[PDB]
Amino acid sequence: TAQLIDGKAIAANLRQQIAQRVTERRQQGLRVPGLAVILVGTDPASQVYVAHKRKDCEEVGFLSQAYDLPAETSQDDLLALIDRLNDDPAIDGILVQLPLPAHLDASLLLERIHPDKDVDGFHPYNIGRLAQRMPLLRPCTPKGIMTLLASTGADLYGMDAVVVGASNIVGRPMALELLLGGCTVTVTHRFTRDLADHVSRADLVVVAAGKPGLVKGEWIKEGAIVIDVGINRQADGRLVGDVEYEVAAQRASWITPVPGGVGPMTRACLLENTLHAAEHLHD
Amino acid sequence: MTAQLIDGKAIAANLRQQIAQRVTERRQQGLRVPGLAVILVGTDPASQVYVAHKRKDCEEVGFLSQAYDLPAETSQDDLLALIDRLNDDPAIDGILVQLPLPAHLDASLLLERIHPDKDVDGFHPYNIGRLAQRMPLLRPCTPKGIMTLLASTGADLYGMDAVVVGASNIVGRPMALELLLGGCTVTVTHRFTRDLADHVSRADLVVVAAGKPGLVKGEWIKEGAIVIDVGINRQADGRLVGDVEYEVAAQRASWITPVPGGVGPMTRACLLENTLHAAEHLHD
């Protein structure tokens, strides 16, 4: 009964729009956006995810620079690579594939990225800027979920929204995006006393919990919008989502099927960030 | 009527002593005294008063003070260079800029020039982002102060339903990030919120920062709730009437802040606490 949000189709529309914009730039003599994607180590998951990023990068016609470093690359060498990419005016976005080898300080390395080239958008400065209602580059997964909400044509102003999975990296950012978008926002987490009462009052539910069946379909308010993205922002391979779909779908006005498009939306908004950076932040 | 009163002025005075006693300990032990550079640009009467308050407190706890009372016409570039020198001075732990600035300066670019490291006010986007991701560097001082007020009640914030009334306010978002880190379930409301009463009346903890007299009705307060009413002026509270209807709220709340209360002293006290922390933990 609920209409379906198709994140995969919206991510494709978004890649298509970015590719066309890039074609309008290149004919106009404007610089093509550059994206450096850095991989360190052997992790099969990370090789697959990085591969999807670069495939999406090529489709959209960005200038791209691959850096497939070996796992024992020093922290300092990696800093010098990030220092050099910041000072390269041909590069608009710098991506450091996660997770990184144990010896590497994850936070130090990621925070070395100029916030205006941090197209993932989770650099602390970027989240802080979102927090104070003037984002530089928005965290791409939350941004991607706002795009999902936008496709429903719903008016978020005054909507009671609930974010389930505060502990997740997307959770706080997601809350800041929804507040920016006009919603009253409740954030819940593992220690929330009565999740059912919070969810049942919500016009909008965003769940990123990685806990199958956590949100009962009975908790969903009639007419609610339900976004179920789990904890993997790069690829959704779940057979069952955090929300119990059947009943949820009987009551929601809009729902994301599971597995859904969180990965493609995340990559699309990542590219969208790279383009914006080029058009707006780098001259 | 029946609510234990949260006294922010007492707590702030108590906190200034501790900073003072710790400074005297460092001074007795030959360790470096924390340094605070306080910048004032222009001559706005309220801004002069507020820096005065900051600098009285700064001298009370025995910090090294550097005062920059600059003229209102001071160039943005000249002010940048001032910030640059202060950033690299090992004697200076905290760099503070009194607001508002004259309108001709890009106040964001200047405030962001400060190393989050020396941002003792704590509202640098980096600092707010670090707080957002559960790994705070220097905590925004007004929200930190509200967390201290709450800690003094002895309450367990874990699984409490908290509501922050004032998203508009510069404190609102950081308040929410503080409350979440403290383990509350947190709802943030603002001018487009529907049924504000329903959100407030479900809350075990209400933090209001609206600058709107009587906005939150005392009848909306949950029985046994903790109620913090700090208005929208972080440096002073001169309201005759608060955001919460005090008389009725006091009959229902377990703890409540009187109004006019201690948001200002608490804010300055936590700013000073961040300077000490900077000195003891972030610098040499």
Numbering used by the authors:
A (entry chain A): 2 to 284
B (entry chain B): 1 to 284
What does the paper say about this structure?
Inspection of folate metabolism in P. aeruginosa drew our attention to the bifunctional enzyme methylenetetrahydrofolate dehydrogenase - cyclohydrolase. The enzymes that synthesize, link and modify tetrahydrofolate (THF) maintain the cellular levels of important cofactors such as methenyl-, methylene-, formyl- and unsubstituted THF. The PaFolD subunit consists of 284 residues arranged as a two domain structure, each with an α/β fold, connected by two long helices.
The structure was subsequently refined to 2.2 Å resolution. In addition a loop, residues 233–241, is disordered in chain D, whilst it is ordered in the other subunits. Detailed comparison of the PaFolD structure with other FolD structures, in particular EcFolD indicates that a loop linking β8 and α10 (residues 231–243) is significantly different and occludes the active site. Since the recombinant PaFolD retains catalytic activity we assign the loop conformation as an artefact of crystallization but which nonetheless indicates a flexibility likely relevant to the enzyme activity. A number of interactions serve to position the flexible 231–243 loop in the active site. Complementary stabilizing associations involve van der Waals interactions between the side chains of Tyr50 and Gln235 together with a hydrogen bond donated from Arg268 NH1 to the carbonyl group of Gln235. These associations would not be formed in the presence of substrate, which would directly interact with Asp121 and Tyr50.
